[PDB]
């Protein structure tokens, strides 16, 4: 099982602005096998009613997909993406910057 | 539209 | 060259733990239009793009019927593949496969494809000439003659040269305005206050389609690679896509930089510069 | 979804002719021409795969277009007498199943080189003699009419091939019930050749 | 003689009955395609198996059923027979390139009830001395009569060895009473030989007519003997006269 490790990018669907509602996206790609598991915490490890598009795979046979929810931010708020997988010694988390 | 596989098309 | 259509297959055997599971997804360029999940008591192909819904019952049945048969067959394939590699029943294995047809700026077939992997590794794939195969190893050689003997090539070719393009052209006209919309990017560049050195200049590209785009920063028409941090292209969740390159280099004379970003959604390559 | 055009086909020995076959298909996996005789099950003649493809073969030539295929028989001999089938496969279904056309029934009338039209009567080899009357050795043109009589049986006709002697021959047969049936009048409704040898 | 092996070739049964057609694919072929052709109708796809293993389903009826066994041979079972079931069922064995190799088909005749089944009588009719004088050809005529249903094959055996040259048997049978449907049938066949051939007394001529009728164990409660599948023959030796 020549296994590859997931790549993650946290970001918003539209330019980051405090006042209005948007969607926080977690883009996992480049990994093998397909068994994944991904969450979008508010630091509080939770975020139910979190959606995602169906599983697929790129030209290099590596799977990829995206999770999302309709969130609203503010300086007080600290969104982030938690991703466990078979090739992780433990879940890797990545914090959401209003950039990147 | 998906192609259809005939007989003896296995690996 | 211009437009494309691919289908993606997974056949996954649960570690000795049950019958395998067949999935199939239909892609046009980057839009996803049909999906089929073996796992259910009444499996059926489902729409994924609005413009496929108009399609009739017999069409959905032709799909459902092939993926229903593929389901049955690929289990025997998984049993033959593992047998080649002397893998035990338990036993987590996967065969994936993607075929399709490529249209140019005109609307004809540029080339077709039918590659396979087993457990994430190139196995057998159709050579450009649509007549010959490429085996990975002595095992994929066993599969090659299985397939020559059944003339698979000659029939993938008939599908690629015929039906495939046929339908591509069909969907194209049907989901035009989204498939042939070609949306340009809302670009800019920003910087955060408390950084390493000077402005954290960020070249942005947003809400564009399709995914084809190119950034690169310059020193009056340049190509850096080493001085710019680049990121891979992601979806916006609403059909659109995103991407950014940036510069935060230790030297900053502020107002004197370009980011040539060109995309088929532009009447010309963009030069960009920000003002406070 | 596959139709064949001349349903019935009636050719004189030697007279070329092409049997049609139309098809509607999602994508064409294959088109097949089969030959079926009465009783037996369809034999394989050709497969055609791509628009423009032709295959040999003996007297039969097979042809594929976008809309249909043609089986051109050249110089039909009588032994080309069979019904001919047309089948397609389709890239849009899995498996190797055929959808067959209705079929083109071909009958080659044999040429008869030297007609000697006659009507003979035959002794039943069993003690009980039942005669049976035999119109024979007539030419292509004379066909045998049925009787509206309830008690006179008149067969259709067919060609004895004496491969051994290059000699073909037509014939029909007619029997019934004794008195009022003496044979010189069995084939009485049929247009019989003016020159017919009627032995006494 | 393609490779497929069908049995039984002939079946005759009563309505509401059950029968089962066998079939064995060409050695090396793994599939089995069942077909039905209704006398003067087209070939309609029924069902199909691959290795196990039901692979496709044409227009088989709620009422019919079939399987393909471990080896590879198939069995199609036809329960609750109707009159309009009577027909030809053609089994086929696909592969690998992959043409379909068909079998010799098996002809099903389903009847209201068996009482109207009769074996053929057969008689040979010697060549007319007139024909001999006038053509020096000798035409034997075989007459197969009073039989039901339309299930025969007539064959000429000369000196123990069947022949095909100089013989012409009628393309179809003839109703002995056109006014009935269950009307019995008659069938005729010509063997023609050289006058001198027929003029040789050591020459033996037998007209063979094989009847396909009632099956081994079946209920016969009619006066007369039971119309089982059987051969009926008429014979004659050459007259040197």
Tab-separated table of N, CA and C in Angstrom, chain C residues 53-170:
chain	number	residue	atom	x	y	z
C	53	UNK	N	-30.355	16.559	-15.604
C	53	UNK	CA	-31.617	16.069	-15.069
C	53	UNK	C	-32.660	15.868	-16.169
C	54	UNK	N	-32.618	16.723	-17.182
C	54	UNK	CA	-33.553	16.615	-18.296
C	54	UNK	C	-33.470	15.258	-19.004
C	55	UNK	N	-32.320	14.599	-18.895
C	55	UNK	CA	-32.114	13.285	-19.506
C	55	UNK	C	-33.166	12.270	-19.076
C	56	UNK	N	-33.516	11.377	-19.997
C	56	UNK	CA	-34.652	10.491	-19.811
C	56	UNK	C	-34.374	9.199	-19.072
C	57	UNK	N	-35.445	8.481	-18.697
C	57	UNK	CA	-35.409	7.247	-17.905
C	57	UNK	C	-34.482	6.183	-18.490
C	58	UNK	N	-34.596	5.944	-19.796
C	58	UNK	CA	-33.797	4.922	-20.471
C	58	UNK	C	-32.312	5.253	-20.403
C	59	UNK	N	-31.983	6.537	-20.417
C	59	UNK	CA	-30.595	6.936	-20.243
C	59	UNK	C	-30.124	6.597	-18.839
C	60	UNK	N	-30.922	6.926	-17.839
C	60	UNK	CA	-30.498	6.617	-16.487
C	60	UNK	C	-30.405	5.117	-16.289
C	61	UNK	N	-31.129	4.355	-17.094
C	61	UNK	CA	-31.134	2.901	-16.949
C	61	UNK	C	-29.937	2.302	-17.656
C	62	UNK	N	-29.568	2.886	-18.785
C	62	UNK	CA	-28.362	2.440	-19.459
C	62	UNK	C	-27.150	2.628	-18.566
C	63	UNK	N	-27.078	3.774	-17.892
C	63	UNK	CA	-26.015	3.983	-16.919
C	63	UNK	C	-26.103	2.980	-15.767
C	64	UNK	N	-27.189	3.041	-15.013
C	64	UNK	CA	-27.398	2.111	-13.929
C	64	UNK	C	-27.078	0.672	-14.323
C	65	UNK	N	-27.369	0.283	-15.564
C	65	UNK	CA	-27.165	-1.113	-15.971
C	65	UNK	C	-25.692	-1.475	-16.143
C	66	UNK	N	-24.916	-0.551	-16.694
C	66	UNK	CA	-23.485	-0.770	-16.884
C	66	UNK	C	-22.723	-0.764	-15.556
C	67	UNK	N	-23.070	0.162	-14.670
C	67	UNK	CA	-22.352	0.278	-13.414
C	67	UNK	C	-22.784	-0.867	-12.509
C	68	UNK	N	-23.995	-1.360	-12.751
C	68	UNK	CA	-24.501	-2.540	-12.065
C	68	UNK	C	-23.781	-3.820	-12.498
C	69	UNK	N	-23.306	-3.844	-13.736
C	69	UNK	CA	-22.635	-5.007	-14.295
C	69	UNK	C	-21.166	-4.871	-13.939
C	70	UNK	N	-20.644	-3.668	-14.118
C	70	UNK	CA	-19.294	-3.371	-13.675
C	70	UNK	C	-19.086	-3.765	-12.209
C	71	UNK	N	-20.062	-3.438	-11.366
C	71	UNK	CA	-20.047	-3.875	-9.977
C	71	UNK	C	-19.757	-5.366	-9.866
C	72	UNK	N	-20.572	-6.170	-10.541
C	72	UNK	CA	-20.437	-7.623	-10.570
C	72	UNK	C	-19.078	-8.068	-11.090
C	73	UNK	N	-18.626	-7.448	-12.181
C	73	UNK	CA	-17.413	-7.895	-12.869
C	73	UNK	C	-16.154	-7.563	-12.055
C	74	UNK	N	-16.038	-6.305	-11.653
C	74	UNK	CA	-14.854	-5.842	-10.944
C	74	UNK	C	-14.525	-6.630	-9.668
C	75	UNK	N	-15.526	-7.276	-9.072
C	75	UNK	CA	-15.312	-8.211	-7.960
C	75	UNK	C	-14.470	-9.400	-8.403
C	76	UNK	N	-14.733	-9.886	-9.611
C	76	UNK	CA	-13.960	-10.992	-10.164
C	76	UNK	C	-12.586	-10.495	-10.609
C	77	UNK	N	-12.524	-9.248	-11.053
C	77	UNK	CA	-11.256	-8.624	-11.378
C	77	UNK	C	-10.393	-8.465	-10.126
C	78	UNK	N	-10.989	-7.951	-9.053
C	78	UNK	CA	-10.283	-7.836	-7.776
C	78	UNK	C	-9.813	-9.197	-7.300
C	79	UNK	N	-10.570	-10.234	-7.614
C	79	UNK	CA	-10.154	-11.571	-7.230
C	79	UNK	C	-9.002	-12.069	-8.097
C	80	UNK	N	-8.900	-11.565	-9.325
C	80	UNK	CA	-7.808	-11.976	-10.201
C	80	UNK	C	-6.540	-11.169	-9.934
C	81	UNK	N	-6.706	-9.907	-9.543
C	81	UNK	CA	-5.564	-9.030	-9.333
C	81	UNK	C	-4.829	-9.468	-8.076
C	82	UNK	N	-5.577	-9.647	-6.992
C	82	UNK	CA	-4.983	-10.117	-5.749
C	82	UNK	C	-4.329	-11.487	-5.934
C	83	UNK	N	-4.907	-12.312	-6.795
C	83	UNK	CA	-4.369	-13.630	-7.062
C	83	UNK	C	-3.010	-13.530	-7.721
C	84	UNK	N	-2.826	-12.506	-8.546
C	84	UNK	CA	-1.562	-12.345	-9.245
C	84	UNK	C	-0.482	-12.004	-8.222
C	85	UNK	N	-0.797	-11.064	-7.335
C	85	UNK	CA	0.167	-10.575	-6.347
C	85	UNK	C	0.204	-11.391	-5.065
C	86	UNK	N	-0.457	-12.542	-5.088
C	86	UNK	CA	-0.516	-13.427	-3.933
C	86	UNK	C	-0.910	-12.721	-2.627
C	87	UNK	N	-1.802	-11.745	-2.738
C	87	UNK	CA	-2.330	-11.046	-1.586
C	87	UNK	C	-3.437	-11.870	-0.936
C	88	UNK	N	-3.497	-11.849	0.392
C	88	UNK	CA	-4.541	-12.558	1.134
C	88	UNK	C	-5.914	-11.881	0.997
C	89	UNK	N	-6.960	-12.578	1.443
C	89	UNK	CA	-8.308	-12.022	1.370
C	89	UNK	C	-8.436	-10.746	2.202
C	90	UNK	N	-7.665	-10.651	3.280
C	90	UNK	CA	-7.809	-9.516	4.183
C	90	UNK	C	-6.562	-8.640	4.295
C	91	UNK	N	-6.375	-7.751	3.324
C	91	UNK	CA	-7.185	-7.777	2.124
C	91	UNK	C	-7.908	-6.501	1.753
C	92	UNK	N	-7.243	-5.364	1.916
C	92	UNK	CA	-7.811	-4.082	1.514
C	92	UNK	C	-7.213	-3.639	0.181
C	93	UNK	N	-7.962	-3.808	-0.909
C	93	UNK	CA	-7.414	-3.583	-2.252
C	93	UNK	C	-8.274	-2.725	-3.173
C	94	UNK	N	-7.635	-2.089	-4.144
C	94	UNK	CA	-8.356	-1.126	-4.944
C	94	UNK	C	-7.883	-1.057	-6.376
C	95	UNK	N	-8.852	-1.081	-7.288
C	95	UNK	CA	-8.580	-0.849	-8.694
C	95	UNK	C	-9.368	0.386	-9.150
C	96	UNK	N	-8.642	1.373	-9.658
C	96	UNK	CA	-9.253	2.610	-10.099
C	96	UNK	C	-8.986	2.746	-11.585
C	97	UNK	N	-9.837	3.490	-12.281
C	97	UNK	CA	-9.716	3.578	-13.727
C	97	UNK	C	-10.438	4.781	-14.294
C	98	UNK	N	-9.796	5.437	-15.247
C	98	UNK	CA	-10.340	6.658	-15.801
C	98	UNK	C	-10.154	6.660	-17.308
C	99	UNK	N	-11.262	6.791	-18.023
C	99	UNK	CA	-11.238	6.819	-19.472
C	99	UNK	C	-12.002	8.030	-19.952
C	100	UNK	N	-11.859	8.360	-21.230
C	100	UNK	CA	-12.557	9.509	-21.765
C	100	UNK	C	-12.006	10.034	-23.069
C	101	UNK	N	-12.569	11.156	-23.504
C	101	UNK	CA	-12.286	11.724	-24.816
C	101	UNK	C	-12.013	13.210	-24.713
C	102	UNK	N	-11.085	13.685	-25.537
C	102	UNK	CA	-10.627	15.070	-25.478
C	102	UNK	C	-11.034	15.860	-26.707
C	103	UNK	N	-11.727	16.968	-26.489
C	103	UNK	CA	-12.120	17.822	-27.592
C	103	UNK	C	-11.202	19.019	-27.710
C	104	UNK	N	-10.988	19.470	-28.940
C	104	UNK	CA	-10.182	20.650	-29.183
C	104	UNK	C	-11.012	21.919	-29.160
C	105	UNK	N	-10.427	23.028	-29.636
C	105	UNK	CA	-11.125	24.309	-29.781
C	105	UNK	C	-12.144	24.238	-30.915
C	106	UNK	N	-12.017	23.217	-31.760
C	106	UNK	CA	-12.969	22.985	-32.841
C	106	UNK	C	-14.183	22.179	-32.377
C	107	UNK	N	-13.932	21.051	-31.725
C	107	UNK	CA	-15.004	20.191	-31.260
C	107	UNK	C	-14.882	18.753	-31.736
C	108	UNK	N	-13.664	18.335	-32.083
C	108	UNK	CA	-13.396	16.950	-32.485
C	108	UNK	C	-12.438	16.255	-31.513
C	109	UNK	N	-12.350	14.932	-31.627
C	109	UNK	CA	-11.526	14.103	-30.746
C	109	UNK	C	-10.028	14.342	-30.958
C	110	UNK	N	-9.343	14.781	-29.904
C	110	UNK	CA	-7.895	14.994	-29.938
C	110	UNK	C	-7.135	13.744	-29.495
C	111	UNK	N	-7.597	13.135	-28.408
C	111	UNK	CA	-7.142	11.806	-28.019
C	111	UNK	C	-8.053	11.247	-26.932
C	112	UNK	N	-7.972	9.938	-26.721
C	112	UNK	CA	-8.777	9.267	-25.718
C	112	UNK	C	-7.912	8.524	-24.715
C	113	UNK	N	-8.534	8.027	-23.652
C	113	UNK	CA	-7.797	7.431	-22.549
C	113	UNK	C	-8.542	6.251	-21.922
C	114	UNK	N	-7.786	5.288	-21.407
C	114	UNK	CA	-8.339	4.221	-20.580
C	114	UNK	C	-7.241	3.638	-19.695
C	115	UNK	N	-6.843	4.380	-18.662
C	115	UNK	CA	-5.799	3.903	-17.756
C	115	UNK	C	-6.376	3.162	-16.568
C	116	UNK	N	-5.530	2.368	-15.936
C	116	UNK	CA	-5.912	1.691	-14.715
C	116	UNK	C	-4.799	1.803	-13.670
C	117	UNK	N	-5.185	1.744	-12.401
C	117	UNK	CA	-4.239	1.509	-11.327
C	117	UNK	C	-4.756	0.373	-10.475
C	118	UNK	N	-3.844	-0.323	-9.809
C	118	UNK	CA	-4.220	-1.249	-8.754
C	118	UNK	C	-3.536	-0.852	-7.454
C	119	UNK	N	-4.329	-0.546	-6.427
C	119	UNK	CA	-3.799	-0.124	-5.121
C	119	UNK	C	-2.999	1.178	-5.237
C	120	UNK	N	-3.428	2.076	-6.122
C	120	UNK	CA	-2.779	3.367	-6.304
C	120	UNK	C	-1.573	3.411	-7.233
C	121	UNK	N	-1.420	2.405	-8.082
C	121	UNK	CA	-0.216	2.295	-8.890
C	121	UNK	C	-0.582	2.027	-10.355
C	122	UNK	N	0.039	2.741	-11.297
C	122	UNK	CA	-0.238	2.509	-12.724
C	122	UNK	C	-0.221	1.009	-13.075
C	123	UNK	N	-1.243	0.532	-13.787
C	123	UNK	CA	-1.341	-0.900	-14.130
C	123	UNK	C	-1.294	-1.103	-15.638
C	124	UNK	N	-2.450	-0.950	-16.270
C	124	UNK	CA	-2.544	-1.012	-17.722
C	124	UNK	C	-3.265	0.236	-18.252
C	125	UNK	N	-2.734	0.796	-19.341
C	125	UNK	CA	-3.308	1.985	-19.961
C	125	UNK	C	-3.215	1.931	-21.484
C	126	UNK	N	-4.199	2.545	-22.134
C	126	UNK	CA	-4.291	2.527	-23.584
C	126	UNK	C	-3.345	3.532	-24.220
C	127	UNK	N	-2.486	3.036	-25.114
C	127	UNK	CA	-1.542	3.874	-25.835
C	127	UNK	C	-2.286	4.847	-26.730
C	128	UNK	N	-1.656	5.974	-27.053
C	128	UNK	CA	-2.334	7.045	-27.796
C	128	UNK	C	-3.004	6.574	-29.093
C	129	UNK	N	-2.388	5.591	-29.747
C	129	UNK	CA	-2.865	5.081	-31.028
C	129	UNK	C	-4.195	4.342	-30.922
C	130	UNK	N	-4.681	4.175	-29.696
C	130	UNK	CA	-5.933	3.458	-29.431
C	130	UNK	C	-5.945	2.045	-30.035
C	131	UNK	N	-4.802	1.370	-29.979
C	131	UNK	CA	-4.722	0.008	-30.476
C	131	UNK	C	-3.871	-0.825	-29.541
C	132	UNK	N	-2.872	-0.197	-28.942
C	132	UNK	CA	-1.937	-0.946	-28.127
C	132	UNK	C	-2.067	-0.610	-26.649
C	133	UNK	N	-1.639	-1.551	-25.817
C	133	UNK	CA	-1.687	-1.351	-24.384
C	133	UNK	C	-0.277	-1.202	-23.805
C	134	UNK	N	-0.225	-0.780	-22.548
C	134	UNK	CA	1.004	-0.710	-21.780
C	134	UNK	C	0.779	-1.449	-20.466
C	135	UNK	N	1.522	-2.534	-20.254
C	135	UNK	CA	1.474	-3.263	-18.986
C	135	UNK	C	2.531	-2.728	-18.022
C	136	UNK	N	2.203	-2.739	-16.735
C	136	UNK	CA	3.151	-2.336	-15.702
C	136	UNK	C	4.182	-3.439	-15.463
C	137	UNK	N	3.703	-4.641	-15.167
C	137	UNK	CA	4.577	-5.768	-14.880
C	137	UNK	C	4.030	-7.060	-15.453
C	138	UNK	N	4.777	-8.142	-15.266
C	138	UNK	CA	4.349	-9.445	-15.758
C	138	UNK	C	2.882	-9.769	-15.424
C	139	UNK	N	2.336	-9.139	-14.391
C	139	UNK	CA	0.944	-9.378	-14.022
C	139	UNK	C	-0.015	-8.577	-14.902
C	140	UNK	N	0.296	-7.306	-15.123
C	140	UNK	CA	-0.495	-6.473	-16.013
C	140	UNK	C	-0.321	-6.929	-17.444
C	141	UNK	N	0.636	-7.828	-17.679
C	141	UNK	CA	0.816	-8.462	-18.990
C	141	UNK	C	-0.215	-9.578	-19.155
C	142	UNK	N	-0.575	-10.187	-18.039
C	142	UNK	CA	-1.569	-11.230	-18.055
C	142	UNK	C	-2.915	-10.606	-18.407
C	143	UNK	N	-3.151	-9.406	-17.881
C	143	UNK	CA	-4.352	-8.619	-18.157
C	143	UNK	C	-4.393	-8.028	-19.581
C	144	UNK	N	-3.220	-7.846	-20.183
C	144	UNK	CA	-3.109	-7.241	-21.507
C	144	UNK	C	-3.638	-8.154	-22.618
C	145	UNK	N	-3.363	-9.445	-22.481
C	145	UNK	CA	-3.748	-10.420	-23.480
C	145	UNK	C	-5.172	-10.868	-23.226
C	146	UNK	N	-5.564	-10.859	-21.967
C	146	UNK	CA	-6.951	-11.054	-21.617
C	146	UNK	C	-7.743	-10.080	-22.477
C	147	UNK	N	-7.193	-8.866	-22.588
C	147	UNK	CA	-7.871	-7.727	-23.203
C	147	UNK	C	-7.655	-7.661	-24.713
C	148	UNK	N	-6.495	-8.090	-25.171
C	148	UNK	CA	-6.278	-8.229	-26.596
C	148	UNK	C	-7.176	-9.330	-27.135
C	149	UNK	N	-7.273	-10.426	-26.392
C	149	UNK	CA	-8.088	-11.555	-26.814
C	149	UNK	C	-9.544	-11.151	-26.919
C	150	UNK	N	-9.987	-10.280	-26.018
C	150	UNK	CA	-11.344	-9.735	-26.091
C	150	UNK	C	-11.417	-8.410	-26.860
C	151	UNK	N	-10.322	-8.018	-27.493
C	151	UNK	CA	-10.369	-6.889	-28.400
C	151	UNK	C	-10.868	-5.619	-27.733
C	152	UNK	N	-10.712	-5.518	-26.420
C	152	UNK	CA	-11.102	-4.319	-25.689
C	152	UNK	C	-10.652	-3.026	-26.372
C	153	UNK	N	-9.420	-2.999	-26.868
C	153	UNK	CA	-8.886	-1.792	-27.496
C	153	UNK	C	-9.812	-1.295	-28.593
C	154	UNK	N	-10.071	-2.170	-29.554
C	154	UNK	CA	-10.899	-1.849	-30.712
C	154	UNK	C	-12.286	-1.307	-30.337
C	155	UNK	N	-12.716	-1.563	-29.109
C	155	UNK	CA	-14.056	-1.174	-28.709
C	155	UNK	C	-14.024	0.061	-27.849
C	156	UNK	N	-12.930	0.253	-27.123
C	156	UNK	CA	-12.732	1.524	-26.450
C	156	UNK	C	-12.534	2.591	-27.506
C	157	UNK	N	-11.866	2.216	-28.590
C	157	UNK	CA	-11.630	3.140	-29.687
C	157	UNK	C	-12.933	3.533	-30.362
C	158	UNK	N	-13.869	2.594	-30.421
C	158	UNK	CA	-15.123	2.849	-31.100
C	158	UNK	C	-15.959	3.751	-30.215
C	159	UNK	N	-15.791	3.596	-28.906
C	159	UNK	CA	-16.469	4.463	-27.953
C	159	UNK	C	-15.849	5.855	-27.933
C	160	UNK	N	-14.521	5.906	-27.960
C	160	UNK	CA	-13.812	7.177	-27.902
C	160	UNK	C	-14.082	8.015	-29.139
C	161	UNK	N	-13.906	7.399	-30.299
C	161	UNK	CA	-14.096	8.081	-31.570
C	161	UNK	C	-15.576	8.391	-31.813
C	162	UNK	N	-16.466	7.561	-31.273
C	162	UNK	CA	-17.890	7.755	-31.469
C	162	UNK	C	-18.639	8.299	-30.270
C	163	UNK	N	-19.355	7.405	-29.603
C	163	UNK	CA	-20.291	7.780	-28.555
C	163	UNK	C	-19.754	8.870	-27.683
C	164	UNK	N	-18.488	8.738	-27.317
C	164	UNK	CA	-17.920	9.593	-26.287
C	164	UNK	C	-18.004	11.050	-26.673
C	165	UNK	N	-17.430	11.366	-27.825
C	165	UNK	CA	-17.459	12.714	-28.350
C	165	UNK	C	-18.912	13.101	-28.566
C	166	UNK	N	-19.652	12.242	-29.258
C	166	UNK	CA	-21.084	12.448	-29.431
C	166	UNK	C	-21.719	13.099	-28.217
C	167	UNK	N	-21.650	12.413	-27.083
C	167	UNK	CA	-22.313	12.884	-25.875
C	167	UNK	C	-21.657	14.118	-25.298
C	168	UNK	N	-20.334	14.174	-25.366
C	168	UNK	CA	-19.636	15.362	-24.916
C	168	UNK	C	-20.311	16.553	-25.590
C	169	UNK	N	-20.314	16.542	-26.924
C	169	UNK	CA	-20.940	17.593	-27.722
C	169	UNK	C	-22.357	17.872	-27.239
C	170	UNK	N	-23.072	16.805	-26.891
C	170	UNK	CA	-24.445	16.914	-26.420
C	170	UNK	C	-24.542	17.742	-25.130
